[PDB]
Design a protein around this ligand. Structure first.
Ligand SMILES: [Cl-]
Ligand SMILES: [Cl-]
Ligand SMILES: [Cl-]
Ligand SMILES: [Cl-]
Ligand SMILES: [K+]
Ligand SMILES: [Mg+2]
Ligand SMILES: [Mg+2]
Ligand SMILES: [Mg+2]
Ligand SMILES: [Mg+2]
Ligand SMILES: [Mg+2]
Ligand SMILES: [Mg+2]
Ligand SMILES: [Mg+2]
Ligand SMILES: [Mg+2]
Ligand SMILES: [Mg+2]
Ligand SMILES: [Mg+2]
Ligand SMILES: [Mg+2]
Ligand SMILES: [Mg+2]
Ligand SMILES: [Mg+2]
Ligand SMILES: [Mg+2]
Ligand SMILES: [Mg+2]
Ligand SMILES: [Mg+2]
Ligand SMILES: [Mg+2]
Ligand SMILES: [Mg+2]
Ligand code: NA
Ligand code: NA
Ligand code: NA
Ligand code: NA
Ligand code: NA
Ligand code: NA
Ligand code: NA
Ligand code: NA
Ligand code: NA
Ligand code: NA
Ligand code: NA
Lengths: 194, 92, 237, 56
RNA sequence: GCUUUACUGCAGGCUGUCGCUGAGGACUCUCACUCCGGGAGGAGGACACCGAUAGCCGGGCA
RNA sequence: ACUCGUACGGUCACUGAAUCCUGCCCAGUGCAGGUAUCUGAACACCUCGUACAAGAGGACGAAGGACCUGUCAACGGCGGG
RNA sequence: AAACAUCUCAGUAUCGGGAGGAACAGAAAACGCAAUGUGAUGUCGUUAGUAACCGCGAGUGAACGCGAUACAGCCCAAACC
């Protein structure tokens, strides 16, 4: 039969309807008062967290991060620029808000490593995301066959190098075929054209 | 100048002389779906849009004749070279 | 060109800032839990560097010593009261509602409890005209009719130091001394006396504005200069 | 007053001094910042790619 | 470098529209949101702010 | 920032002590106000088109413009016959 | 580009953040010599200055496949406990 988890998920397909709607209308009020990075005891979306690697266990941490909505906060040119480069208003960043959020979280917990993240809604001027981080130094994790991989040296600061899930999709690495000529194996090896 | 609305002349389709009717070519409406229409949208962005930032040229003092010759029997039309004419009016 | 003077202002550099460290007190009404039992005694009359007008030091029953926006006719020893039950005499503060009409008031609050915003300069005064269980129409010194919450506290009387504007500075030196006590760059160079690069009115073989002086409300900073969105100009008509 | 020789006489102010971090006489004692290594401004040592030719 | 009713654009201002955003061509309300208030509470209120977009102005700037 | 500030304030400009004074002009340009009607973008809406879509057209119409007015100690003007 | 605005120089110079001895990628929601076919990923040779872009100007510019190098394939979430 259906898992209870399936219900959390089914609700989040329409965060603007039903009980979840009223729930969000309430939470955000408290959220808008919390900081930029708040550690939370339990994931707001259990199904999603667990689906992404979460585990009620020592060394596993979760944090909700808030980020402003919209295009790039850019300063206008202060020297000569051809018309093509005089833009300010329509310029958008190449890194999506979710990655920004994943980075702000990881910096807050210097010793932890990003595992994954998911959205938990947005009001008119900001978006919230919950990030799952892991303590690569806690033995409870170094002995977990399903996570100890994140303990390796080469997984250090993985979020800042785009090795995250959101980091990899944003890098255009989803497709294995047509369209990924300039993305795989990396954007930089392809002269930054993807 | 003046010109007959109908008159006998060669029909390239029938391959034989017949009465044709002369009419000025009414411009057709664009669909906005040609390749050029797509390039305009695609290539226009921040700053100058190259060729798409240009505007309508101008006008020659007198235009050439722009007519359609319709074969009175087979119903098909053909085009001819035009000649400069300040004004062109039909007779009947 | 270069940013005009009006633009250098906003950065808030020394030259444009007010000598705040040399100011005495931020003149605001007291915060009473409620009751009116709040009264104090005028202890001294001091000069307020920020307004070129006197201000009065007052000691309140509850040991509180604070400077206050002094209305005209307040002396050392006088007893002032602040509350809903405040007596109706010069220097006392109480909500517009409890104040009788036709009585001049000063240091009027825009929002009940904001401490007072209107009518605070030398010799000015507001005029409470109408009441109601909702609106308290007051006429500010500019001549405008301002609808206000009757719960807004105010002070009875006209501000002290009236008539300060009647005497001419006569000389540059006097202007200078006053100017030094304000957040303002002085003296003033005319735009038309500048170079094209420094001001929209600069340049030329002779001095004259380049275009018309009336500028649109929508004009951008660096260009909004001269007669801003003037509905009319001159004296004629 | 000449901006040259005559204005050189007023120069008796001490600004740049031996730096505690790098040893260069670039520590600005007024700003408490080394113009050479970045001490006082950055934990990381000051360095730029323009300090050498682009392909070197 | 500078100017302007030179060409092309870019900030900025004004204005419509969408999101935030809710209850009963004009209107009431309160619950988001904003502001005043130490607080209780007051004012304002689905507007404003902010995000997006559209039209106008736009040598302030390239 | 102005601002420990509140129109007897402070911002933006012009002229430049005193004395006697400061005429005529609102067509153009500017600014501002109004505006029956005209013009006026996008979303949503209606029609056609497309098993959908592109697209074409319609209805509505904000600021703005037309149009009207105010204003020269606003840019400036004050001739020929 | 014999001017110049798209284009080009170039995702270069330079700047911000970070890893390792190598990084990154990686076991198909692939390919599409259309097949009764191939079978994770890098890289080298080629495909090819071809397809594609472009005031269709000047310029710009891949991929599949093939020949090689080296080869390696697995773990969760959920169902049921
Ligand atoms: Cl990380
Ligand atoms: Cl013709
Ligand atoms: Cl003054
Ligand atoms: Cl194949
Ligand atoms: K260029
Ligand atoms: Mg590589
Ligand atoms: Mg453009
Ligand atoms: Mg104050
Ligand atoms: Mg004066
Ligand atoms: Mg000063
Ligand atoms: Mg002057
Ligand atoms: Mg000069
Ligand atoms: Mg200028
Ligand atoms: Mg003069
Ligand atoms: Mg003059
Ligand atoms: Mg010099
Ligand atoms: Mg506040
Ligand atoms: Mg220029
Ligand atoms: Mg050239
Ligand atoms: Mg050419
Ligand atoms: Mg290129
Ligand atoms: Mg291919
Ligand atoms: Mg297992
Ligand atoms: Na970290
Ligand atoms: Na790309
Ligand atoms: Na494109
Ligand atoms: Na001038
Ligand atoms: Na020059
Ligand atoms: Na006029
Ligand atoms: Na006029
Ligand atoms: Na050349
Ligand atoms: Na040139
Ligand atoms: Na081009
Ligand atoms: Na083959």
């Amino acid at each position: 039969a259906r898992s209870a988890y399936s219900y959390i998920r089914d609700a989040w397909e329409n965060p603007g309807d039903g009980q979840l709607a009223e729930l969000q209308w309430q939470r955000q009020q408290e959220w808008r008062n919390e900081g930029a990075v708040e550690r939370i005891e339990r994931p707001t979306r259990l199904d999603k967290a667990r689906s992404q690697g979460y585990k009620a266990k020592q060394g596993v941490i979760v944090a909700r991060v808030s980020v402003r909505k919209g295009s790039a906060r850019k300063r206008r040119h202060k020297a000569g620029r051809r018309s093509k480069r005089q833009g300010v208003t329509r310029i958008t960043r190449r890194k999506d808000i979710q990655r920004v959020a994943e980075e702000r979280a990881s910096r807050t917990f210097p010793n932890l490593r990003v595992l994954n993240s998911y959205s938990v809604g947005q009001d008119g001027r900001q978006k919230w995301h919950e990030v799952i981080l892991i303590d690569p130094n806690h033995p409870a994790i170094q002995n977990d066959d399903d996570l100890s991989w994140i303990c390796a040296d080469d997984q250090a600061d993985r979020v800042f190098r785009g090795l995250t899930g959101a980091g990899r999709r944003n890098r255009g690495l989803s497709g294995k075929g047509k369209g990924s000529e300039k993305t795989r194996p990396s954007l930089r090896s392809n002269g930054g054209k993807a | 100048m003046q010109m007959p609305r109908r008159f006998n002349t060669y029909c390239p389709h029938c391959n034989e002389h017949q009465e044709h009717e002369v009419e000025k070519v009414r411009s057709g409406r664009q669909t906005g779906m040609k390749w050029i229409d797509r390039q305009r949208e695609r290539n226009s962005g921040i700053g100058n849009d190259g060729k798409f930032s240009k505007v309508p040229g101008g006008d020659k003092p007198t235009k050439k004749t722009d007519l359609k010759y319709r074969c009175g029997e087979c119903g098909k039309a053909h085009l001819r070279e035009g000649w400069r004419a300040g004004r062109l009016e039909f007779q009947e | 060109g270069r940013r005009i003077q009006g633009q250098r202002r906003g950065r808030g550099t020394s030259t444009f800032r007010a000598p705040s460290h040399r100011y005495k007190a931020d003149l605001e009404h007291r915060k009473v839990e409620d009751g009116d039992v709040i009264a104090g005694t005028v202890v001294d009359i001091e000069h307020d560097p920020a307004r070129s007008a006197p201000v009065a030091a007052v000691e309140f029953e509850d040991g509180d010593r604070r400077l206050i926006l002094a209305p005209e006719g307040v002396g050392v020893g006088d007893e002032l009261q602040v509350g809903v039950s405040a007596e109706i005499a010069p220097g006392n503060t109480l909500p517009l509602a409890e104040i009788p009409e036709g009585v001049p008031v000063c240091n009027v609050e825009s929002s009940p409890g904001d401490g007072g915003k209107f009518a605070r300069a030398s010799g000015v005064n507001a005029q409470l005209l109408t009441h109601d269980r909702n609106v308290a129409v007051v006429k500010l010194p500019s001549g405008e009719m301002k609808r206000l919450d009757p719960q807004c506290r105010a002070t009875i009387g006209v501000v002290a130091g009236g008539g300060r504007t009647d005497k001419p500075f006569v000389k540059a030196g006097n202007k200078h001394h006053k100017m030094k006590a304000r957040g303002t760059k002085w003296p003033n160079v005319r735009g038309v006396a500048m170079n094209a690069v420094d001001h929209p009115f600069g340049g030329g073989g002779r001095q004259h504005p380049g275009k018309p002086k009336s500028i649109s409300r929508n004009a951008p900073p660096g260009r909004k200069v001269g007669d801003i969105a003037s509905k009319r100009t001159g004296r004629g008509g | 007053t000449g901006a040259g020789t005559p204005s050189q006489g007023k120069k008796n102010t001490t600004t740049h001094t031996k730096c505690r971090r790098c040893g260069e006489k670039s520590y600005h004692t007024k700003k408490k910042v080394c113009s050479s290594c970045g001490f006082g401004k950055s934990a990381k040592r000051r360095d730029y790619e323009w300090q050498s030719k682009a392909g070197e």
